[PDB]
Design an enzyme around this catalytic site. Structure first.
Site, PDB file in Angstrom:
ATOM      1  N   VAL A 161       0.839  -1.192   0.000  1.00  0.00           N
ATOM      2  CA  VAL A 161       0.000   0.000   0.000  1.00  0.00           C
ATOM      3  C   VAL A 161       0.876   1.245   0.000  1.00  0.00           C
ATOM      4  O   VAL A 161       0.986   1.942  -1.015  1.00  0.00           O
ATOM      5  CB  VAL A 161      -0.956  -0.001   1.209  1.00  0.00           C
ATOM      6  N   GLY A 162       1.495   1.537   1.141  1.00  0.00           N
ATOM      7  CA  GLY A 162       2.283   2.744   1.288  1.00  0.00           C
ATOM      8  C   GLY A 162       3.488   2.559   2.185  1.00  0.00           C
ATOM      9  O   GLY A 162       3.852   1.428   2.521  1.00  0.00           O
ATOM     10  N   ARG A 163       4.116   3.665   2.583  1.00  0.00           N
ATOM     11  CA  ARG A 163       5.351   3.639   3.369  1.00  0.00           C
ATOM     12  C   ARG A 163       5.142   4.506   4.610  1.00  0.00           C
ATOM     13  O   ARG A 163       5.380   5.717   4.582  1.00  0.00           O
ATOM     14  CB  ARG A 163       6.540   4.123   2.534  1.00  0.00           C
ATOM     15  N   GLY A 164       4.695   3.884   5.697  1.00  0.00           N
ATOM     16  CA  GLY A 164       4.567   4.566   6.969  1.00  0.00           C
ATOM     17  C   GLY A 164       5.874   4.555   7.730  1.00  0.00           C
ATOM     18  O   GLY A 164       6.965   4.544   7.147  1.00  0.00           O
TER      19      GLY A 164
ATOM     20  N   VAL B 209       5.896   0.939   6.300  1.00  0.00           N
ATOM     21  CA  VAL B 209       5.576  -0.183   5.425  1.00  0.00           C
ATOM     22  C   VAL B 209       4.206  -0.748   5.790  1.00  0.00           C
ATOM     23  O   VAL B 209       3.995  -1.217   6.907  1.00  0.00           O
ATOM     24  CB  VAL B 209       6.660  -1.278   5.504  1.00  0.00           C
ATOM     25  N   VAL B 210       3.280  -0.699   4.833  1.00  0.00           N
ATOM     26  CA  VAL B 210       1.921  -1.198   5.013  1.00  0.00           C
ATOM     27  C   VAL B 210       1.563  -2.062   3.815  1.00  0.00           C
ATOM     28  O   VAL B 210       1.963  -1.767   2.684  1.00  0.00           O
ATOM     29  CB  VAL B 210       0.908  -0.043   5.171  1.00  0.00           C
TER      30      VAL B 210
ATOM     31  N   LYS C  94       0.393  -3.647   9.111  1.00  0.00           N
ATOM     32  CA  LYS C  94       1.597  -2.832   9.264  1.00  0.00           C
ATOM     33  C   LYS C  94       2.642  -3.677   9.987  1.00  0.00           C
ATOM     34  O   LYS C  94       2.737  -3.656  11.218  1.00  0.00           O
ATOM     35  CB  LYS C  94       1.283  -1.541  10.023  1.00  0.00           C
TER      36      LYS C  94
ATOM     37  N   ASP D 147      -0.233  14.354  15.811  1.00  0.00           N
ATOM     38  CA  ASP D 147       0.079  14.427  14.379  1.00  0.00           C
ATOM     39  C   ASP D 147      -1.198  14.254  13.552  1.00  0.00           C
ATOM     40  O   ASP D 147      -1.389  13.283  12.816  1.00  0.00           O
ATOM     41  CB  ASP D 147       1.128  13.385  14.017  1.00  0.00           C
TER      42      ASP D 147
END
Ligand SMILES: */C=C/C(=O)Oc1ccccc1Nc1nc(Nc2ccc(N3CCN(C)CC3)cc2)ncc1Cl
EC number: 2.7.11.25
Length: 288
Positions: free
Chosen positions: A16-19, A22-23, A36, A126
């Site tokens: 999916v994305g880069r938290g 990494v997800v 996650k 945040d």
């Protein structure tokens, strides 16, 4: 409190994305879920503090949480992040004033729940669109815990003992962002400290043309330098709930397209993306 699932039952589908960790997307028990995974020994201690709090949390407008390797099985949000909807890759979807207000209403509802938890009040800190997810055709908003200077209250990065009124400041910025469909403090740019210096010295996003005074008033109050002069989240929720009477059509999914053109707002005053003509109309019916 939490359901215990092993990696055998999980079926990883795609990234999916880069938290921070990494997800990855997955399908477990006939349900789409985002996971996650940790890939570091240092990051495991973050789970210990967060899992105690996240297990107790349960709210419609907050992400739901459904072990080797150590992971967090959370619910998958088909709509993506609010940031991607507003400023992401083409084609961008169309949305109205009703959607913008509804997103901010659902956001204030989720943060109010966190503020009111016992024994201690959980502060999100945040709070920004990249962490606001969307589901059900982009109509329902979901908050998710864990270049943020644009949404960060001045007293926070000053080093002072911040209160939960820092989230209220972030909400104010987000309110300006969904109405204008502009990245806050994009014209400043540069490294993070150049925005911190601006916000600390009193700079705020420009005023919006033809904005309703009640909305302008709530927005500016959220921007105030003094945290005590900002309203509580309970007050925002209540005000935003009574304003939705004049913003019908918030349950309509996002499906129409929008072509991206940004006029540069000169003279320190910008045009809104959404249209308030229907608001002033419905406001006249009740008032006179
Ligand atoms: C909720 C806190 C958090 O960090 O959520 C994020 C942020 C960034 C990436 C991934 C996650 N985790 C997450 N994601 C979803 N659903 C989802 C689905 C699609 C996207 N993308 C669409 C395509 N572009 C290219 C990128 C973004 C992002 C997120 N649902 C729940 C969670 Cl916890």
């Amino acid at each position: 409190s939490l359901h215990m699932i092993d990696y055998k039952e999980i079926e990883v589908e795609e990234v999916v994305g880069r938290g921070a960790f990494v997800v990855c997307k997955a399908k477990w028990r006939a349900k789409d879920v985002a996971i996650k995974q940790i890939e570091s020994e240092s990051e495991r201690k973050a789970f210990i503090v967060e899992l105690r709090q996240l297990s107790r949390v349960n709210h419609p407008n907050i992400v739901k949480l459904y072990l080797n390797p150590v992971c967090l099985v959370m619910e998958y949000a088909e709509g993506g992040s609010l940031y991607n909807v507003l400023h992401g890759a083409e084609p961008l979807p169309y949305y109205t004033a009703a959607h913008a207000m509804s997103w901010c209403l659902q956001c204030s509802q989720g943060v109010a729940y966190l503020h009111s938890m016992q024994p201690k009040a959980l502060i999100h800190r945040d709070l920004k669109p990249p962490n606001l997810l969307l589901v059900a055709g982009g109509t329902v908003l979901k908050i998710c815990d864990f270049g943020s200077a644009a949404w960060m209250a001045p007293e926070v990065f000053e080093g002072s003992n911040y209160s939960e009124k820092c989230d209220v400041f972030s909400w104010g910025i987000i309110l300006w962002e969904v109405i204008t469909r502009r990245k806050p403090f994009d014209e400043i740019g540069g490294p993070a400290f150049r925005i911190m210096w601006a916000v600390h010295n009193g700079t705020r996003p420009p005023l919006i043309k033809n904005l309703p005074k009640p909305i302008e008033s709530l927005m500016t109050r959220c921007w105030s330098k003094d945290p005590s002069q900002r309203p509580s989240m309970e007050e925002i929720v209540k005000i935003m709930t009574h304003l939705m009477r004049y913003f019908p059509g918030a349950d309509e999914p996002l499906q129409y397209p929008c072509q991206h053109s940004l006029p540069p707002g000169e003279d320190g005053r910008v045009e809104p993306y959404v249209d308030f003509a229907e608001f002033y109309r419905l406001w006249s019916v009740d008032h006179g």
